[PDB]
Design a protein around this ligand. Structure first.
Ligand SMILES: [Cl-]
Ligand SMILES: [Cl-]
Ligand SMILES: [Cl-]
Ligand SMILES: [Mg+2]
Ligand SMILES: [Mg+2]
Ligand SMILES: [Mg+2]
Lengths: 244, 204, 221, 231, 195, 241, 250, 195, 243
């Protein structure tokens, strides 16, 4: 019957690894690099667009950086289509929590649930896992500014600074070298761009090949603003740090 | 045992010159017993204002529901919902519960951010749209409000004048209804500023 | 009050503009003339939410059908889809509709009861003003009506309803669907009930209303 | 070879190998004999033990007062099919106040076995049954095979070395068919028949299992000291 | 008032043209004679909604039947009507007379009353509230009648019923089912009243 | 190579199971032809009865789907009858739901969409048939729409299907180059059948007896098949000219 | 019986490739060239009508499809897969938007819904991916004119101008040279016809070319008058004659 | 299940709940505690249909205790009240609705403020300085409107509660067998041993 | 390759090998025939006597559907029984809705569509039987033969099983020598002869003959088994013809 054509996507190797999870991670390693850096007074998200074309509409484009609610954003690395399925789920989970408790969802709770959905696809159903790694940048009134990552395994961990996708090995060494705990957002912006500038497979890092976002308390008195940078705003911050 | 008149309360909306006004009483009761004098019936999703009269549990539930739906709208559309579109969403959501309806009389008020056109609308409990140039009324003193509005209202009132007209329309209607009153709130809505005034009224 | 009148080269539907909850007039100028399709129009009586909802659902499904078949939709399709939907709910959806339109087959005029029965006629009327309207139609209808004659007869039948029926009032809405032409929708075709000037102006002196508190509402991000 | 993975695959010569493997389970099973006259029908079964400390596997199951079978192969499958027969016999009684015809019993087992040979995921039954009964058309003996093939016979045998007993019954046919109104003599013919399928081992008191149904005899099973008479 | 009469050449179906809501005549030119197949027609009584829904489903079943198995018998059409009426008797209020012409069987008449039972008769008549009459002038009806005789018989029978009813009224419609084809007849009040 | 057993993509972006379904189309070794008149649509198909024990009246690859739509199948009779029953069901359901007779081209699209699903869903195999739908549509007039196992469909001025399809196609192509029009400029359907048969004889290079052919004719408000005697009368007319 | 294929037919290979998506893109590459160009005051989408037979009526087969009054779609790859996607796209524009908000969806959100359907065919049990790439041109009040490409993976990208299928590599190079941010609609149609002539080998006229625009509102195509806010569809399919007129001044 | 009172003072919330359980014409118990601790700084009193009250209270208690373990965090009184309201708002359009009325008294450790929530069986939530369910409010609200002061202490709040209970014992037809009083402050939940 | 391992898989030829493998099971089965006559149909089958221990006349292979349709098959006997069970459900549901007993062509397509359905999926196995069936309806006598592919046609005479080629040859002679038609009583005698002639291809074990018939004149349009004197008369006629 149909048993003949079943890939068995949810089985262990003799070494005790999940084939499809390992191969999904291999897929993600070829995706454009995404960096998250957490400062004392905000979080930076920086992502590299996958080999841009000159005739691609840059200003009205969203590939890497998505908004989950007013306090939480994600940077994507992997299949964009897969990511959008999970993002819409996360956006609904956040509104369900707000509807139930009349409080914005704590960052970890949203991350755990999205991570638990990925886990399910590795343990049952016989379907391929989601070929997606997320960097979650968020704020809540409990833990303040928080960075997390999740991967197709459904495992998630917290970070002061982290990279996903291409050249993470190289990127993580550079972040580990220059990062310190009493860092400001403006300093973290400079670190994120300098790191992408050195790890990129492109000849030179330009505004048209970048997505950028900050989560600051820059708005008046104890409130968080999400700034998804425009093309012209990336062009300016790229000149100001002296990369172009 | 008539759900629409257990908790009581009223909403009225009016159009002026380049402005709208929406107002409500603050009473929540259990029939004869007054329970709360701080129960606001007007909510806003961006620049779109929604008043809801009727069964208070459904007023709270629909507020929580339209916050949910407009939050998701904004994330996907990357812009705040407009009054005309929100009206259609209220209509859709009410008629979805056609044979198990929310016992409510919702009122939409706001200015279209693009055209600058003042907009008001009212609905029955299953979501039939009443679109009106002049005014919309809802609640246990709807008859009283219709009488006040139909006589007091004139077109193209300035914000400061429209305030007096809607305030007097509500106060005098609430004073002739047992299940309405215990304080009142009036929102004056201009294109890019919104003033909220609490009215002094008799507490009986 | 809603009427349908067939003429030489098409069909005309007319309606009043009064919405009521009990004895109170909720809307003085509501539109009871619905577009199922560009050249298929509907007049609705009964539960206002039900007539709008059932008209939009069939209208949506007709549009999708028109795209799939690459053909202008037919009135019999709108009729068949409406009657089967209404029959399913056994009259619990209180929509009484006059369905008129022009399609490749020709010009059609139908009525649909809330329980899912349909009729065919040269002239029809529905709603609380149907008997007032039908009296005018029975008195003045003739075979081989011209378009100008048909509009007059339809608007006269609505007028009978407006004056003599408490459920009907305000203005008259007409939609004319002629073969080989765009359907013309004449919103507020007649306005014979204009509110007379008020004797006095009830504009209040500013500061008349006592105010406990003032605050600025933040609607921005 | 390549066409024996499941019951949904024909071989290039038009064979169902999973069915033929199920048939093989019966040949490994202990011998059981069936034979009938015009008045009575008899089942004789050689029960098998795991060792001298163990009991002897029961081969004969009662289905109604007028019908029962003996099994050879997977005992749990005999339990499933015998339970199904009990329900069909019971349905016939409750709904129609009618004893289920032995022929209809056969037809129902056939159709149940067949569905398990045409559907993916399921497997064929791994047991053969000898159904005896007395209904409105007299005494009956059926042979069931998990291919679905059911056959009405004067006599037969299934299990290991069954060919010996089957040859004897083929010779004796004209004798035992006319044993009318004499239960003990028809059993004796059944015990002499199963004896032709013995090697080294002989029939002992806790080894032999006999069942009988007939004109004025409900389906009754004889085991232990009750079968000592026929050794 | 609806009746179907079998005659020499085939069968004729007749009815009034009046539909009522309370005492108000909703339609005074109603077509109560419905085509479920080229030469299988029915007369509808009871709920207008219920009879239309059933007549539409039966027409679908006979169209599908014709595609697969060719032209269906009048008996087959009656059976489909009964099945819908009997199985949904709790939620339905429909009384139906089925009349059809076969070249083999000629004219046949079947009645499905409120019960959901089926009866094959030479003729049938229903008046007031889907009320079938067993006798209805048994000496006024003879087997193998003429077209004009049959038309005259139905015209008279329905006129008498409209004289004493109130439910029935307007024009008399008839459908003639024969080998020749299908004919539609209409009689206005001024003709049929003076009888 | 399990990418050749089910309807999934091969490395070169092909569905082999779809391509093999097309080859099953010609398993019957029968050629069909469809042309349009002014008022009518004619479809002719070869009728081969090799066994002497067969009842020739029951051997047919032309189906009366509805009262206005006819359909000729090129492929094995089991898949032909599977498609026929479904088309009959779909045509009847359409009339019930939408209150008018299903058009030829809309039925074609519906059957093509069903065929498409078999090419995307793994558990279902494609039907090894090509469906040629004919009618005189009340909006579009004389209509020919043809479906295949890939889920492809299109309208035709005229068409041919079967082993010697290309020979019949070029024969018709050359006629329409000469006549300079999109149809057979002929009043009666009788003469449009005579054209269809004549051009099949010229293309295949074979003569036909009354039992060698099978003819379907669509007119306004009915599609019907010709009897052996109806074809015989038609063959006599060709011979006497 | 029953669908026993409840497992993914698209899985990760050790290299991290999704084979069935890669192979679907190969099917798109074999497909006939289609392109889209965005102007300041409109969008043009165009493709060749590769006719299977000259006896076939190429009018009946429509490669350029209206999705909403203001959104149109063209494809490269497997035609049948496109036809069912158009059906599903038209329906989802109603069920998941118009029947909720009482207005047609904006281009990016209908694209998002089409993308979702195609992503599901990539992960759901017992199905292969769709063997098509879509170009969706549309207008909406708050985003203006926009052009999107959708791939078998479910990925979508916004384009100023692009091409897909047989001669896309050459076509994209041609568009890069000709495209600027000051193009009027007529200029974009002219460039579209120039770009498409390169990829077409046989006859090049209004009968072998299919072309549609998202431009000004068309009151004449609405089918009724009387509602001032309803000004008619922005999607218009150019006629055989209208194309031939622009091929003379080429 | 009859009398449940609540007073929010400066630094605490006081819940008073009647001790009597009456089934038919007999008082089964005179020491019943009509309250469940939802979290260390959140207390819920309840009154309504027999069985439903305790079943609902324990169900809420389990769900809040589950959240506390999962997140190692105490949910705010506002959050707990919003959760409880949504559960009751589901109940009212169920096959068989929970007929339970609740007061939720909590100390918010983030705001350092006491909070009292009143939710009826329909899911009608309201935040109040003082609240009651059923006929309790009819006698006590006039007293509270008069004697209640916003900057009152816990001792002042207990004296004002004694005045409410004395008025109820005088003018109420049933013997509710006195009240169990529980204070919710920054230090948690304690019971007044003698009242 | 491996195109023959799974049902519903097209080979590069465009063939379903699993269906062709099912035909081999049919070819392996005993001989069964059908003869269409003036006003009805005759069915006959070869029953191999494996052992003396088989009860004569009490292992009936020909099955009735409704009251007017006969069914006989060669191949996997249980598969035939499964198909007849389905045929009875189809005939019952037809009669329930349409009143009239199912016409033979109508009934033929019901079996046809069901058998064809078992060639559409790999989760199911094709039927390992060719089924000869027919009877009398309003339009007269009808004989059909249905194969594992779902393919069926009308027949003047039909044959399937191990002795099909022998039976077909003897059937072809009857069609040629009786163009104006064969009578019901004649067709019973001819059926017997053809089974005896077809038994030459299966002559290791001796056999038992079984005949049934539907005739408008002889059985009043109902399906009956040929028993007693009429069966022995047909056997005697067949015995005289082989010698
Ligand atoms: Cl009617
Ligand atoms: Cl047919
Ligand atoms: Cl479809
Ligand atoms: Mg008051
Ligand atoms: Mg497939
Ligand atoms: Mg309350």
């Amino acid at each position: 019957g149909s048993r003949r054509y079943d890939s068995r996507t949810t089985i262990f190797s003799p070494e005790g690894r999940l084939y499809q999870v390992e191969y999904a991670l291999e897929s993600i390693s070829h995706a454009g690099t995404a960096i998250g850096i957490m400062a004392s007074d905000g979080i930076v998200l920086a992502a590299e667009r996958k080999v841009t074309s000159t005739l691609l509409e840059q200003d009205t484009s969203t590939e890497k950086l998505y908004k989950l609610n007013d306090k939480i954003a994600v940077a994507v690395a992997g299949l964009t289509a897969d990511a959008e399925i999970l993002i819409n789920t996360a956006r609904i989970h956040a509104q369900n929590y707000l509807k139930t408790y009349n409080e914005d969802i704590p960052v970890e709770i949203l991350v755990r649930r999205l991570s638990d959905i990925k886990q399910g696809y590795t343990q049952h159903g016989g379907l391929r896992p989601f070929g997606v790694s997320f960097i979650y940048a968020g704020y809540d009134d409990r833990y303040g500014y928080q960075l997390y990552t999740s991967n197709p395994s459904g495992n998630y961990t917290g970070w002061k600074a982290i990279s996903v996708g291409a050249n993470t090995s190289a990127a993580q060494t550079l972040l580990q070298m220059d990062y310190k705990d009493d860092m400001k957002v403006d300093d973290a912006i400079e670190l994120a761009l300098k790191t992408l500038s050195k790890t990129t497979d492109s000849s030179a890092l330009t505004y048209d090949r970048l997505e950028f976002a900050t989560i600051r308390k820059g708005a008046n008195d104890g409130e968080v603003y999400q700034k998804i940078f425009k093309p012209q705003e990336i062009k300016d911050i790229l000149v100001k740090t002296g990369i172009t | 045992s008539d759900p629409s008149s257990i908790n009581g309360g009223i909403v009225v909306a009016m159009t002026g010159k380049d402005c709208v006004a929406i107002a409500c009483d603050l009473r929540l009761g259990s029939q004869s017993l007054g329970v709360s004098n701080k129960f606001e019936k007007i909510f806003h999703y961006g620049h779109v204002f929604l008043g809801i009269t009727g069964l208070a549990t459904d007023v709270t539930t629909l507020n929580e529901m339209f916050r949910y739906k407009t939050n998701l709208y904004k994330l996907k559309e990357e812009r705040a919902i407009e009054p005309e579109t929100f009206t259609q969403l209220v209509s859709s959501s009410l008629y979805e519960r056609r044979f198990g309806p929310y016992f409510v009389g919702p009122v939409v008020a706001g200015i279209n951010s693009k055209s600058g056109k003042p907009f008001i609308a009212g609905f029955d409990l299953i979501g039939c749209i009443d679109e009106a140039k002049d005014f919309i009324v809802s609640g246990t003193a709807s008859d009283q409000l219709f009488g006040m509005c139909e006589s007091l209202y004139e077109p193209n009132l300035e914000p400061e004048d429209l305030f007096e007209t809607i305030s007097q329309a509500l106060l005098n209607a609430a004073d002739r209804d047992a299940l309405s009153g215990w304080g009142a709130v009036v929102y004056i809505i201009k294109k890019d500023e919104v003033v909220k005034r609490y009215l002094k009224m008799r507490q009986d | 009050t809603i009427v349908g009148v067939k003429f030489n080269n098409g069909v005309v539907i007319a309606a009043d503009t009064r919405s009521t909850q009990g004895p109170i007039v909720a809307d003085k100028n509501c539109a009871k003339l619905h577009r199922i399709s560009p050249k298929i129009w509907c007049a609705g009586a009964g539960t206002a939410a039900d007539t709008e909802a059932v008209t939009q659902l069939i209208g949506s499904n007709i549009e999708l059908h028109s795209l799939y078949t690459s053909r202008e939709p037919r009135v019999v399709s709108a009729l068949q889809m409406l009657k089967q939907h209404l029959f399913k709910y056994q009259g619990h959806i209180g929509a009484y509709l006059i369905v008129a339109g022009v399609d490749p087959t020709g010009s059609h005029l139908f009525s649909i009861h809330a329980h899912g029965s349909t009729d065919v006629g040269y002239y029809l009327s529905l709603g609380s003003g149907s008997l007032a309207a039908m009296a005018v139609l029975e008195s003045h209808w003739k075979q081989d009506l011209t378009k100008e004659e048909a509009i007059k007869l339809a608007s006269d039948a609505i007028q009978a309803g407006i004056w003599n029926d408490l459920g009907s009032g305000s203005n008259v809405d007409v939609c004319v669907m002629e073969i080989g032409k765009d359907a013309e929708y004449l919103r507020n075709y007649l306005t014979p009930n204009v509110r007379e000037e008020k004797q006095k102006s009830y504009k209040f002196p500013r500061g008349t209303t006592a105010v406990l508190k003032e605050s600025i509402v933040n609607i921005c991000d | 070879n390549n066409y024996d993975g499941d019951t949904v695959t024909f071989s290039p010569t038009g064979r169902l190998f999973q069915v033929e493997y199920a048939l093989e389970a019966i040949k490994q099973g202990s011998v059981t004999v069936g034979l009938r006259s015009n008045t009575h029908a008899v089942l004789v079964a050689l029960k098998r033990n795991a060792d001298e400390l163990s009991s002897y596997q029961k081969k004969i199951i009662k289905c109604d007062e007028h019908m029962g079978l003996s099994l050879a192969g997977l005992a749990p499958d005999a339990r499933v099919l015998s339970n199904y027969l009990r329900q069909q016999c019971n349905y016939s009684s409750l709904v129609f106040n009618r004893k289920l015809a032995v022929e209809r019993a056969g037809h129902l087992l056939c159709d149940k076995a067949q569905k398990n040979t045409q559907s993916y995921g399921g497997r064929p039954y791994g047991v053969g049954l000898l159904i005896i009964g007395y209904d409105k058309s007299g005494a009956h003996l059926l042979e069931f095979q998990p291919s679905g093939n059911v056959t009405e016979l004067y006599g037969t045998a299934i299990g290991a070395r069954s060919q010996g007993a089957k040859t004897y019954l083929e010779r004796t046919l004209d004798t035992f068919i006319k044993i009318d109104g004499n239960p003990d003599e028809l059993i004796k013919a059944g015990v002499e028949a199963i004896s032709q399928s013995l090697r080294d081992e002989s029939l002992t008191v806790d080894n032999l299992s006999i069942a009988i149904v007939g004109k004025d005899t409900p389906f009754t099973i004889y085991d232990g000291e009750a079968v000592a008479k026929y050794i | 008032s609806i009746m179907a009469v079998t005659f020499k050449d085939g069968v004729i179906l007749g009815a009034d043209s009046r539909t009522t809501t309370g005492a108000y005549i909703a339609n005074r030119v109603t077509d109560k004679l419905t085509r479920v197949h080229d030469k299988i027609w029915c007369c509808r009584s009871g709920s207008a909604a219920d009879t239309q829904a059933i007549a539409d489903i039966v027409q679908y079943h006979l169209e599908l039947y014709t595609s697969q198995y060719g032209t269906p018998s009048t008996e087959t059409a009656a059976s489909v009507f009964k099945e819908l009426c009997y199985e949904n008797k709790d939620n339905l209020t429909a009384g139906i007379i089925v009349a059809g012409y076969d070249d083999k069987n000629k004219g046949e008449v079947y009645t499905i009353p409120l019960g959901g039972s089926v009866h094959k008769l030479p003729y049938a008549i229903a008046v007031s509230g889907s009320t079938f009459i067993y006798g209805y002038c048994d000496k006024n009806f003879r087997e193998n009648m003429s077209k004009e005789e049959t038309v005259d018989f139905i015209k008279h029978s329905l006129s008498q019923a409209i004289k004493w009813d109130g439910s029935s009224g307007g024009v008399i419609r008839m459908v003639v089912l024969t080998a020749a084809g299908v004919e539609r007849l209409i009689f206005y009040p001024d003709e049929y009243e003076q009888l | 190579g399990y990418d050749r057993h089910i309807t999934i993509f091969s490395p070169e972006g092909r569905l082999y199971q779809v391509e093999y379904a097309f080859k099953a189309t010609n398993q019957t070794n029968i050629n069909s032809l469809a042309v349009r008149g002014k008022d009518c649509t004619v479809v002719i198909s070869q009728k081969k009865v090799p066994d002497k024990l067969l009842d020739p009246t029951t051997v047919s690859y032309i189906f009366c789907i509805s009262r206005t739509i006819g359909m000729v199948v090129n492929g094995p009779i089991p898949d032909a009858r599977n498609a026929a029953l479904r088309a009959k069901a779909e045509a009847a359901e359409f009339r019930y739901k939408y209150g008018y007779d299903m058009p030829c081209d809309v039925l074609a699209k519906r059957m093509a969409n069903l065929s498409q699903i078999y090419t995307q869903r793994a558990y279902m195999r494609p039907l090894g048939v090509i469906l040629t739908f004919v009618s005189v549509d009340e909006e579009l007039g004389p209509s020919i729409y043809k479906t295949d196992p890939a889920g492809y469909y299109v309208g035709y001025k005229a068409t041919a299907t079967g082993p010697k399809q290309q020979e019949i196609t070029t024969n018709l192509e050359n006629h329409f180059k000469k006549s300079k029009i999109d149809h057979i400029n002929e009043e009666s359907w009788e003469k449009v059948v005579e054209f269809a048969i004549t051009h099949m004889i010229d293309a295949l290079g074979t003569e036909f007896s009354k039992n060698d052919l099978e003819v379907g004719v669509a007119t306004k408000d009915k599609f019907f098949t010709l009897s052996a005697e109806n074809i015989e009368e038609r063959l006599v007319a060709i011979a006497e000219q | 019986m029953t669908d026993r294929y409840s497992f993914s037919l698209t899985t990760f290979s050790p290299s991290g490739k999704l084979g069935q998506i890669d192979y679907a893109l190969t099917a798109v590459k074999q497909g006939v060239t289609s392109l889209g160009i965005k102007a300041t005051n409109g969008v043009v989408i165009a493709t060749e009508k590769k006719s299977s037979s000259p006896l076939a009526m190429s009018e009946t087969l429509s490669k350029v499809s209206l999705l909403t009054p203001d959104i149109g779609a063209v494809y490269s790859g497997m035609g049948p897969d496109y036809r069912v996607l158009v059906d599903k796209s038209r329906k989802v524009a109603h069920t998941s938007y118009k029947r909720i908000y009482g207005e047609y969806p904006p281009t990016k959100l209908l694209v998002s819904e089409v993308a979702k359907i195609m992503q599901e065919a990539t992960q759901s049990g017992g199905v292969r991916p769709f063997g098509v790439s879509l170009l969706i041109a549309g207008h909406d009040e708050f985003n203006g004119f926009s052009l999107y490409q959708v791939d078998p993976s479910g990925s979508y990208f916004p384009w100023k101008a692009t091409a897909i299928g047989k001669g896309s590599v050459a076509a994209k190079t041609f568009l890069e040279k000709r495209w600027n941010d000051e193009l009027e609609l007529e200029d974009a149609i002219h460039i579209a016809l120039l770009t498409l002539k390169e990829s077409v080998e046989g006859e090049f006229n209004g009968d072998t070319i299919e072309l549609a625009i998202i431009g000004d509102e068309n009151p004449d195509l609405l089918g009724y008058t009387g509602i001032p806010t309803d000004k008619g569809p922005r999607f218009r399919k150019l006629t055989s004659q209208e194309i031939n007129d622009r091929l003379e001044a080429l | 299940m009859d009398i449940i009172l609540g007073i929010r003072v400066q630094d605490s919330v006081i819940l008073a709940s009647s001790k009597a359980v009456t089934r038919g014409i007999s008082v089964l118990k005179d020491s019943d505690d009509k309250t469940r601790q939802l979290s260390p700084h959140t207390l819920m009193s309840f009154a309504g249909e027999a069985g439903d009250t305790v079943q609902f209270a324990e169900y809420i208690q389990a769900n809040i205790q589950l959240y506390s373990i999962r997140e190692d965090y105490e949910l705010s009184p506002q959050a707990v009240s919003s959760f409880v309201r949504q559960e009751l708002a589901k109940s009212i359009r169920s096959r068989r609705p929970y007929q339970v009325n609740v007061l939720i008294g909590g100390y918010d450790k983030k705001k350092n403020k006491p909070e009292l929530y009143q939710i009826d069986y329909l899911g009608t939530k309201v935040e109040l300085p003082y609240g009651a369910h059923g006929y309790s409010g009819f006698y006590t609200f006039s007293l509270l409107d008069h004697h209640y002061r916003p900057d009152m202490t816990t001792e002042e709040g207990l004296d004002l509660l004694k005045l409410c209970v004395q008025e109820l014992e005088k003018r109420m037809p049933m013997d509710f067998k006195g009240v169990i009083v529980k204070i919710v402050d920054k230090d948690g939940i304690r019971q007044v041993d003698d009242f | 390759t491996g195109y023959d391992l799974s049902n519903s898989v097209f080979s590069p030829d465009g063939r379903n090998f699993q269906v062709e493998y099912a035909v081999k099971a049919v070819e392996n089965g005993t001989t069964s025939i059908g003869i269409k006559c003036n006003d009805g149909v005759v069915f006959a089958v070869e029953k191999l006597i494996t052992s003396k221990l088989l009860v004569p006349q009490k292992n009936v292979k020909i099955q009735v559907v409704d009251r007017h349709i006969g069914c006989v098959y060669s191949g996997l006997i249980p598969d035939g029984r499964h198909l007849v069970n389905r045929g009875r459900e189809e005939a019952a549901s037809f009669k329930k809705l349409y009143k009239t007993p199912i016409p033979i062509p109508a009934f033929a397509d019901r079996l046809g569509q069901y058998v064809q359905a078992h060639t559409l999926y790999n989760s199911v196995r094709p039927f390992g039987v060719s089924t000869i069936f027919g009877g009398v309806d309003k339009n007269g006598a009808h004989l059909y033969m249905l194969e594992p592919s779902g393919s069926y046609w009308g027949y003047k005479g039909a044959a399937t099983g191990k002795g099909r080629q022998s039976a077909k040859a003897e059937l072809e002679k009857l069609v040629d020598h009786h163009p104006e038609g064969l009578s019901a009583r004649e067709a019973v005698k001819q059926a017997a002869k053809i089974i005896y002639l077809a038994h030459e291809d299966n002559k290791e074990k001796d056999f038992e003959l079984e005949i049934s018939w539907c005739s408008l004149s002889e059985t009043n349009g109902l399906h009956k088994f040929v028993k007693g004197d009429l069966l022995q008369e047909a056997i005697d006629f067949a015995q005289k013809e082989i010698n």
